[PDB]
């Protein structure tokens, strides 16, 4: 079976450079929208991320095509997924809107060109200063998370004499087959209890500068099944319908959140999405079909807002990291007898550069971009440069082991695929390694830097100290 695993992985390798809309090969190198990534990793210092604006556009089209059966849909990119300004601008250019989770996320969306009526503000903590900024900028929605926050919205909206447009976020009591930390609709810190929606909405109606637009929920992240979306949307729809009758109102909209999964493992025939959510399980079309069906049982004219994040960018980046050292190690037992030997390959990216590979057991395809057409036929362990004993990549092809060509040598470029969601803002300067540069491939296939690597002077500029040596 360990040869079949190896055989299967190289079947996947050949699929990347043969039937993948993102990738080709040239001179034995992995290519991304026609850009030789080996050559690219010689022009910029590794490790760095390369994003594909073509692939962002493709993903966005998939999301929008998915909702064709409901004309009045509004799509808000969850900027928490990636808020590099060049990536935000590409998403604005593609024609959808923006969702933000903090005052500075709202500000950067405004700065990059999203209008206030293109921005939704989510979050379990919106301090008075955050609310005042949001209300002064005529945000499309502030998705109210608590009665405490609502009291501030009432007072600040009156103070500003500006209408605050709100959804009431409710927990629909719907679990999902994703990471425990990634469920947000079941025993959650976020949202009001469903039971509190009625009186909350009633009070918003009486508030002169707070305009109730609808109800909000968000199921979770990387949800690999359509049923949670159907169940949760039904809860929201049923309460929306009931409140319309009870309160004598007509809701502008309903906001069903995000959570469309992205494939991080592609050989679906070998995977069970309900046991391993690296298998996506559903497409954007399944998500749309589930949401739209439930909403249409209530109104076909109401506006549906969605908040996809991961799906917009997840598949649209690659992490490029150079093999920087190598060693063979012996593993002994407690009495000093050999157990095995381990071929360690060290790349210049650790978990401070790719957080979820460590902290959320996230799988990304790993290939030798310099030897993309070579058989990946050696079992190796892939370590980062950090001090932590545990800074190596545990989510291997088999156990903690990866497959690379037996010819791999120091200086080869290793590529992590599907590296575009939740990979940039989560970086650290642990061990004072810099956070990575970020390169963008535009619609013409041309590359440019859209974020610099942190410089040394960046490592210290935040500190206040007396310099001792120049």
Ligand X SMILES: Cc1ncc(COP(=O)(O)O)c(CN)c1O
Footprint of ligand A1AZK on 211-240 (CB under 6 A): 221
Taking CB under 5 A as the criterion, which residues in 188-207 touch Na ion? 205, 207
Q: What's the CA gap between 420 and 422, in Å, rounded? A: 7
Q: Which stretch binds ligand X (CB under 6 A): 86-94, 160-168, 232-240, 308-316?
A: 308-316
210 binds, among Cl ion, a copy of itself, Na ion, none (CB under 5 to 8 A by kind): Na ion
53 binds, among Na ion, Cl ion, ligand X, none (CB under 5 to 8 A by kind): none
- Rounded to 10 deg, the angle between the 284-296 and 227-247 helix axes is 30
Q: Which stretch binds ligand X (CB under 6 A): 75-83, 274-282, 343-351, 390-398?
A: 75-83
Place of tokens 């001792």: 468
Shortest distance (Å) from residue 116 CB to ligand X: 18
Taking CB under 6 A as the criterion, which residues in 404-433 touch ligand A1AZK? 422, 426
Taking CB under 6 A as the criterion, which residues in 332-391 touch ligand A1AZK? 356, 360, 387-388
Question: Nearer Cβ to a copy of itself, position 61 or 359?
Answer: 359
Per-residue DSSP letter, 58 = H
Q: What's the CA gap between 191 and 235, in Å, rounded? A: 14
Q: How do 164-171 and 141-144 pair as beta strands?
A: parallel
Taking CB under 5 A as the criterion, which residues in 29-88 touch Cl ion? 74-75
Q: Which stretch binds Cl ion (CB under 5 A): 8-16, 97-105, 144-152, 309-317?
A: 97-105
Taking CB under 5 A as the criterion, which residues in 208-237 touch Na ion? 210
- Residue 218 touching ligand X (CB under 6 A): yes
- Report how far apart, in Å, the C-alpha atoms of 318 and of each of 41, 132, 160, 408, 412 are: 11, 38, 45, 19, 15
Q: Which residues contact 310 (CB under 8 A, 6 or more apart)?
A: 78, 81, 221, 222, 258, 259, 260, 261, 262, 421, 422
Alpha-helix runs per DSSP H in 267-333 = 284-296, 310-313
Q: Which residues contact 465 (CB under 8 A, 6 or more apart)?
A: none
Shortest distance (Å) from residue 72 CB to Cl ion: 10
307 binds, among a copy of itself, ligand A1AZK, ligand X, none (CB under 5 to 8 A by kind): ligand X
Contact map string, positions 98 to 137, toward ligand X, x by CB under 6 A: -x----------------------x---------------
* CA-based nearest residue to 120, from 174, 165, 156: 165
Question: Nearer Cβ to ligand A1AZK, position 155 or 182?
Answer: 182
Q: With the C-alpha atoms ordered 322, 324, 330, 333, is the resulting torsion angle positive or negative? A: negative
Query: Which residues are at the interface with ligand A1AZK (CB under 6 A)?
Result: 80, 182, 221, 356, 360, 387-388, 422, 426
């Amino acid at each position: 079976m360990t040869d079949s695993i190896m055989q299967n992985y190289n079947q996947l390798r050949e699929q990347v450079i043969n039937g993948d809309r993102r990738f080709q090969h040239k001179d034995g190198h992995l290519c991304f929208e026609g850009v030789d990534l080996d050559a690219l990793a010689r022009q910029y210092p590794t490790p760095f991320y390369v994003f594909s604006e073509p692939e962002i556009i493709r993903n966005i089209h998939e999301i929008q095509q998915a909702f064709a059966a409901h004309k009045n849909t509004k799509t808000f990119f969850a900027s928490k997924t990636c808020s590099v300004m060049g990536v935000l601008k590409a998403i604005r250019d593609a024609g959808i809107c923006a969702e933000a989770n903090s005052q500075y996320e709202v500000r950067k969306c405004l700065e990059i060109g999203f209008r206030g009526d293109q921005i939704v503000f989510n979050g379990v903590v919106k301090k008075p200063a955050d609310l005042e900024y949001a209300i002064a900028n005529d945000l499309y929605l502030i998705n109210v998370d608590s009665l405490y926050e609502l009291e501030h919205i009432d007072a600040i909206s009156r103070k500003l004499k500006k209408v605050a447009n709100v959804c009431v976020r409710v927990e629909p009591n719907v679990p999902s087959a994703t990471h425990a930390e990634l469920v947000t609709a079941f025993h959650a810190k976020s949202g009001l209890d469903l039971e509190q929606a009625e009186e909350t909405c009633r009070r918003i109606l009486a508030m002169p500068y707070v305009h109730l637009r609808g109800l909000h929920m968000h199921v979770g992240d990387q949800v690999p099944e359509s049923e949670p979306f159907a169940k949760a949307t039904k809860v929201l729809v049923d309460e929306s319908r009931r409140l319309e009758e009870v309160l004598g109102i007509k809701f502008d909209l309903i906001n069903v959140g995000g959570g469309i999964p992205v494939p991080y493992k592609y050989d679906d025939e070998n995977g069970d999405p309900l046991k391993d959510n690296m298998y996506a399980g559903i497409t954007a079309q399944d998500f749309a079909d589930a949401v739209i069906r439930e909403v249409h049982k209530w109104r076909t004219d109401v506006e549906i807002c969605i908040e996809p994040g991961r799906k917009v960018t997840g598949s649209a980046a690659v992490l490029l990291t150079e093999v920087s050292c190598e060693k063979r190690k012996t593993n002994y037992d407690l009495n000093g007898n050999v157990e095995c030997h381990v071929e360690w390959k060290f790349v210049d990216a650790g978990y401070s550069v790719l957080s979820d590979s460590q902290h959320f057991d996230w799988f990304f395809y790993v290939y030798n971009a310099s030897r993309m057409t070579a058989a990946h036929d050696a079992w190796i362990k892939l370590a980062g440069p950090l001090s932590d004993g545990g800074d190596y990549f545990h989510m291997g092809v088999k156990g903690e082991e990866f497959l690379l060509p037996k010819e791999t040598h120091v200086g080869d470029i290793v590529a992590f695929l599907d590296a575009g969601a939740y990979t940039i803002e989560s970086q650290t300067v642990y061990n004072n390694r810099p956070r990575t540069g970020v390169v963008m491939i535009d619609k013409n296939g041309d590359t440019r830097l859209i974020r610099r690597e942190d410089s040394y002077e960046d490592m210290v500029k935040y500190d206040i100290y007396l310099l001792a040596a120049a």
